[PDB]
Amino acid sequence: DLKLPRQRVDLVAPPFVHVHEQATKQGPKIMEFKLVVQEKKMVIDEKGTTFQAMTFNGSMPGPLMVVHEGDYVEVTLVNPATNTMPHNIDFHSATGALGGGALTLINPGEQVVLRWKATRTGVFVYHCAPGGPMIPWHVVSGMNGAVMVLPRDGLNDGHGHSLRYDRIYYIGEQDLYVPRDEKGNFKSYDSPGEAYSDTEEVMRKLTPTHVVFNGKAGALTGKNALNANVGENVLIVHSQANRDSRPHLIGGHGDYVWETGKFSNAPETGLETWFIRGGSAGAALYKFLQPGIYAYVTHNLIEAANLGATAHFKVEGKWNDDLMTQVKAPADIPTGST
Amino acid sequence: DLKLPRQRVDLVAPPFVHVHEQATKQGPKIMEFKLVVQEKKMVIDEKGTTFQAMTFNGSMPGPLMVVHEGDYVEVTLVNPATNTMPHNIDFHSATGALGGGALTLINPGEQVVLRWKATRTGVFVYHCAPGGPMIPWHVVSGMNGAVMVLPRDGLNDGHGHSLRYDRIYYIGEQDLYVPRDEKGNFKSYDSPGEAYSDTEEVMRKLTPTHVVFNGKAGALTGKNALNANVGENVLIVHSQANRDSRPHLIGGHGDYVWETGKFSNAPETGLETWFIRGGSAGAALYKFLQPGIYAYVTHNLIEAANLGATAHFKVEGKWNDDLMTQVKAPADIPTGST
Amino acid sequence: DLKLPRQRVDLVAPPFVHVHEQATKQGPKIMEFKLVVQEKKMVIDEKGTTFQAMTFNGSMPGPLMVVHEGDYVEVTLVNPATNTMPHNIDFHSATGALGGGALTLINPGEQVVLRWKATRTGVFVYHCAPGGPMIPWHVVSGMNGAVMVLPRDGLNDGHGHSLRYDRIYYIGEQDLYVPRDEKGNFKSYDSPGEAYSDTEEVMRKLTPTHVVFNGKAGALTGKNALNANVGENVLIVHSQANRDSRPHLIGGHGDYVWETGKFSNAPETGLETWFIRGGSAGAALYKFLQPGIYAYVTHNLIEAANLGATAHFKVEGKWNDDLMTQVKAPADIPTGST
Numbered sequence A, B, C: 001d002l003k004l005p006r007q008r009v010d011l012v013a014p015p016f017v018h019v020h021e022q023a024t025k026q027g028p029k030i031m032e033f034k035l036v037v038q039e040k041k042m043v044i045d046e047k048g049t050t051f052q053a054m055t056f057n058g059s060m061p062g063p064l065m066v067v068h069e070g071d072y073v074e075v076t077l078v079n080p081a082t083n084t085m086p087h088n089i090d091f092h093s094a095t096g097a098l099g100g101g102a103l104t105l106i107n108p109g110e111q112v113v114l115r116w117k118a119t120r121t122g123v124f125v126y127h128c129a130p131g132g133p134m135i136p137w138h139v140v141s142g143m144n145g146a147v148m149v150l151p152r153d154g155l156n157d158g159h160g161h162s163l164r165y166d167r168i169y170y171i172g173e174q175d176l177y178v179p180r181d182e183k184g185n186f187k188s189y190d191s192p193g194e195a196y197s198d199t200e201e202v203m204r205k206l207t208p209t210h211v212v213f214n215g216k217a218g219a220l221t222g223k224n225a226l227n228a229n230v231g232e233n234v235l236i237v238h239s240q241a242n243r244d245s246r247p248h249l250i251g252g253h254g255d256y257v258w259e260t261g262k263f264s265n266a267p268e269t270g271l272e273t274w275f276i277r278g279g280s281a282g283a284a285l286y287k288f289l290q291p292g293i294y295a296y297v298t299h300n301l302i303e304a305a306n307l308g309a310t311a312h313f314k315v316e317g318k319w320n321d322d323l324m325t326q327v328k329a330p331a332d333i334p335t336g337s338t
């Protein structure tokens, strides 16, 4: 019945994004994606703490899907028989049936195919939602990602000017609730089901033990810093499926920010810190003006520095002393000073 | 001195709203409302937990009041002699005297009459605020509701087009702080005063034991789901007098959202999840496009599924396979699959 | 090389603000500021609790700096040899080098001079950020303030009309994490370093013990209430370097609010409660219409009343009975009443 060209997309692991056009002159297509659920123990912090994760495509976050307004998105969700739990998928971009959740519940050994029309532009969360208490559990165990629905003319500034990014990164932020023993040491388990009761008790107190980007403390620092160059316009998509965040690029700004994440609304300009509501994605464009290291954080700095929520950008280029300069390097305070 | 027609309004219990006009050609009136404080033990969760509530008109939230810009609102607040505490009322819609609180403190056995001019459009919180530590206590014990001040031309989209709702619902969200004994069981008391000291200790740690709509976990699910039909534009007013929330309609969107709640500002379009600042009301319009069950949550999913903060809509009509369809029902993963 | 006039600014302690022009016809200048770090034990609540604070210029918050777009800001940061820790400064208003942090690390007995160009309008946080876990620690120990970069034409309403304030106040909100002993009593220490380990444990649980304006519970109540007069337009700048807040003026509104704090964006009108993202400053203009006491709070009322986060305004002038009046004072409920 639906007679449109079909196009298979190969997803890539975050923070990278599969290839796509910004502006397009192609008409609507059926964009075909496959997500494979993987339950697995994963390392989440720099001390080697593990937890019983549940993922789309083996990553936290799940991969970013990119389509254009008016495309149809045909998703094959697979739940391998090595998994232990039922799973499903809810797209916040989609209309009806609990975002798809009511049409995608699959037991281990099953797959399902859902199609939804991309009628709403923006960045949106997708997440598992099997029912009842299993909804938060699967989400905070890692089963969430995002989808971006671009206007067919690409982004604009809400004032009639086109905006184009040179690079895009997807930062998925995950709140984790890892059980502790009586002495405060993190507990380990042999399966997600075994971890559940103790995890739920932590969840109920609404205070994460870890807040991480790309699935673990330090994931996007060091050798895995995000690259850019002076002069490049970078789109930073940020999602949080369960809990609020307040992104900030240390040493930079958000030139154009859609903190609620929806491209039918004009962006705000020149922000220091923006706000991702739990259960949403947002996006910020920034044109780098200075080389060096930038930290990208949630600006609850306890979370950023002590719970895992810091990424780095490494930006190549030439320093601009007009924007900032060290007029005098550290020196002893003058004895004359009063 | 004030020579305007008077109109008595009969309030109705949330989530329903008393009858009113959207657009009106009536001039300003003195709109007369009565609120009666009721202290009573109430059931707040599906396991039968009770707590010593304090209410306007016997409900959590208090009822939604609806007037138009330039009306005067004349409120008789009654504190029956069966109550134990003084009470008052602060309207965030009002100008002066701490929103009215400084003019409305009444002991049991007293009533007072306050008039305020509806100079500011939007949805607004009202709440009790007796003074000092009693302010948060009375609020988190249930003494909060909302008022909507409509423009006399009704709502608009901020771009010169009228917006009209077919139905309106008021969702009051309440954070509760129920004491526990040493084993974790919820404690019961014979009066609000007896509950206070233990409740304050819970409050101080800023983590609710329950987060509920319409006064209890499950209040708006099952037989009390909210009704709508495909094609109807529904206004969902959401308030939170003490603590942030992030509303989300699962399977839907916010077509037009005033998350800060004030109609002099253009709404945002096409949101997935919006944000109600503690101490405010906001509102979202959505036109239903698909039948079935929708969950309406705060998108901290722990709160939603595990602390009580889920409502349902039951929407009648015909399914639109163009927007969403199950292309292939759950099936065994092909043996060929790699 | 940079050949512009230089102008030394003398800072003043919050909540007051150093003298400045709104609109100016002066061209760009090098505006010279000095900040002196002071580590000291400070009283933070009305029961006399102390903690080992770290400050810019001896105050929490640090003082508000005011410049205009296109000015250069040349800051001498001094770390006296009586201090124990290294310190630095990150300006969210600045571009490059982690906001300046990477160019300003000074040991006790040193000073440094940083210049940054004020290319971005709005109110912005500045804070210490020495590296790693020391970043949140120094910030939540008090080392944060704000800077305002005004357009050279002053403020506007985003619709072509000038806005001018008669008074400005800077409210810095500080979340504090004071250790407790086994019985719940707050602990005291002889130095910041001695307090660190126990403080970090409190920080990790993300629940402040105190939330204060101007450095202590009650700082801006009583004799230190903020003054205004009926008819005056007051700008209230609010910052929070680490944690979200939801400001509300009890009995008033935000006539024009830049909750994200950046003057290139039109303000929202007529808000009840606004939202300061942790890691940002915002600002609200209000024209007082009624005399009397107003409370200014974060509208988590537990925080406001029980953790310290209430300020007062005392407003002189004549009461307007048209906006609000007590129609009937408290009286016994009529025996006839049903």
Ligand SMILES: OC[C@H]1O[C@@](CO)(O[C@H]2O[C@H](CO)[C@@H](O)[C@H](O)[C@H]2O)[C@@H](O)[C@@H]1O
Residues within 6 Å of the ligand: A047, A048, A049, A050, A051, A185, A186, A187, A188
């Ligand atoms: O012996 C515990 C010690 O080993 C580490 C090694 O990296 O991790 C082990 O214990 C953690 C806490 O139970 C588990 O999360 C992990 O699976 C296990 O390898 C340290 O993190 C830990 O302190």
Ligand SMILES: OC[C@H]1O[C@@](CO)(O[C@H]2O[C@H](CO)[C@@H](O)[C@H](O)[C@H]2O)[C@@H](O)[C@@H]1O
Residues within 6 Å of the ligand: A119, A120, A121, B255, B269, B270, B287, B289
């Ligand atoms: O807004 C994008 C997309 O939403 C649809 C519904 O699929 O329309 C919604 O939003 C419209 C514009 O705000 C409303 O007029 C409409 O009533 C509502 O359903 C599409 O028609 C539109 O392209």
Ligand SMILES: OC[C@H]1O[C@@](CO)(O[C@H]2O[C@H](CO)[C@@H](O)[C@H](O)[C@H]2O)[C@@H](O)[C@@H]1O
Residues within 6 Å of the ligand: A047, A049, A183, A184, A185, A186
């Ligand atoms: O945090 C409580 C208490 O637990 C200990 C181990 O007994 O450390 C645990 O907690 C730390 C904070 O989350 C982690 O860094 C560590 O991996 C974990 O074992 C104590 O060191 C701490 O005091």
Ligand SMILES: OC[C@H]1O[C@@](CO)(O[C@H]2O[C@H](CO)[C@@H](O)[C@H](O)[C@H]2O)[C@@H](O)[C@@H]1O
Residues within 6 Å of the ligand: A291, A292, A293, A317, A319, A325, A326, C097, C102, C103
């Ligand atoms: O890219 C930052 C990197 O560049 C170096 C020179 O190789 O210094 C530049 O950047 C500094 C600011 O971080 C400037 O103060 C300096 O003048 C400029 O040359 C490195 O020192 C720095 O790590």
Ligand SMILES: OC[C@H]1O[C@@](CO)(O[C@H]2O[C@H](CO)[C@@H](O)[C@H](O)[C@H]2O)[C@@H](O)[C@@H]1O
Residues within 6 Å of the ligand: B047, B048, B049, B050, B051, B185, B186, B187, B188
């Ligand atoms: O015996 C306690 C058991 O009874 C229930 C019955 O619905 O509730 C009682 O105890 C609760 C916890 O103290 C009270 O809140 C309630 O008032 C009382 O009826 C169960 O909830 C509870 O576990």
Ligand SMILES: OC[C@H]1O[C@@](CO)(O[C@H]2O[C@H](CO)[C@@H](O)[C@H](O)[C@H]2O)[C@@H](O)[C@@H]1O
Residues within 6 Å of the ligand: B119, B120, B121, C255, C269, C270, C287, C289
């Ligand atoms: O804005 C609605 C209503 O507010 C009043 C005061 O009661 O005006 C306020 O807002 C105006 C428009 O933003 C400001 O110009 C004015 O100074 C401020 O008091 C009413 O006059 C107005 O209708």
Ligand SMILES: OC[C@H]1O[C@@](CO)(O[C@H]2O[C@H](CO)[C@@H](O)[C@H](O)[C@H]2O)[C@@H](O)[C@@H]1O
Residues within 6 Å of the ligand: B047, B049, B183, B184, B185, B186
């Ligand atoms: O939550 C702590 C601990 O308390 C127990 C009773 O000892 O359950 C209480 O807490 C649950 C979570 O809030 C409630 O569902 C229940 O109504 C309440 O009695 C334990 O079951 C729980 O482990």
Ligand SMILES: OC[C@H]1O[C@@](CO)(O[C@H]2O[C@H](CO)[C@@H](O)[C@H](O)[C@H]2O)[C@@H](O)[C@@H]1O
Residues within 6 Å of the ligand: A097, A102, A103, B291, B292, B293, B317, B319, B325, B326
């Ligand atoms: O209204 C939802 C309700 O309708 C039924 C048919 O009575 O199925 C419709 O809705 C489904 C999506 O929830 C579609 O997949 C189906 O094709 C459509 O007929 C019920 O199954 C469903 O509960």
Ligand SMILES: OC[C@H]1O[C@@](CO)(O[C@H]2O[C@H](CO)[C@@H](O)[C@H](O)[C@H]2O)[C@@H](O)[C@@H]1O
Residues within 6 Å of the ligand: C047, C048, C049, C050, C051, C185, C186, C187, C188
């Ligand atoms: O004896 C403790 C008692 O004295 C007070 C006096 O104002 O404060 C002392 O103890 C506090 C808690 O340790 C310290 O913060 C403070 O430095 C010290 O003067 C009371 O606050 C306290 O309960």
Ligand SMILES: OC[C@H]1O[C@@](CO)(O[C@H]2O[C@H](CO)[C@@H](O)[C@H](O)[C@H]2O)[C@@H](O)[C@@H]1O
Residues within 6 Å of the ligand: A255, A269, A270, A287, A289, C119, C120, C121
């Ligand atoms: O926006 C104020 C200020 O920012 C600068 C960079 O220092 O420009 C940024 O914002 C512009 C307008 O949004 C973008 O066009 C530009 O690419 C971005 O760097 C200044 O040029 C501008 O005055």
Ligand SMILES: OC[C@H]1O[C@@](CO)(O[C@H]2O[C@H](CO)[C@@H](O)[C@H](O)[C@H]2O)[C@@H](O)[C@@H]1O
Residues within 6 Å of the ligand: C047, C049, C183, C184, C185, C186
């Ligand atoms: O809050 C726990 C418990 O501690 C005590 C002292 O044992 O009080 C402390 O905590 C109060 C709440 O923060 C403070 O008002 C007080 O300054 C502090 O000593 C008990 O009174 C309280 O029950």
Ligand SMILES: OC[C@H]1O[C@@](CO)(O[C@H]2O[C@H](CO)[C@@H](O)[C@H](O)[C@H]2O)[C@@H](O)[C@@H]1O
Residues within 6 Å of the ligand: B097, B102, B103, C291, C292, C293, C317, C319, C325, C326
């Ligand atoms: O400024 C408030 C202050 O003024 C007094 C008179 O001196 O009363 C005025 O304000 C009241 C509202 O707070 C009005 O109800 C009253 O009619 C008006 O005169 C004081 O009572 C009040 O503290």
Ligand SMILES: O=N[O-]
Residues within 6 Å of the ligand: A041, A050, A051, A052, A187, A188, A189, A190, A191, A195
């Ligand atoms: O180690 N994780 O269960």
Ligand SMILES: O=N[O-]
Residues within 6 Å of the ligand: A085, A086, A087, A130, A134
């Ligand atoms: O059923 N989900 O675990």
Ligand SMILES: O=N[O-]
Residues within 6 Å of the ligand: A248, A250, A251, A301, C090, C092, C098, C099, C129
């Ligand atoms: O400026 N960043 O913490």
Ligand SMILES: O=N[O-]
Residues within 6 Å of the ligand: B041, B050, B051, B052, B187, B188, B189, B190, B191, B195
């Ligand atoms: O049972 N409530 O006190």
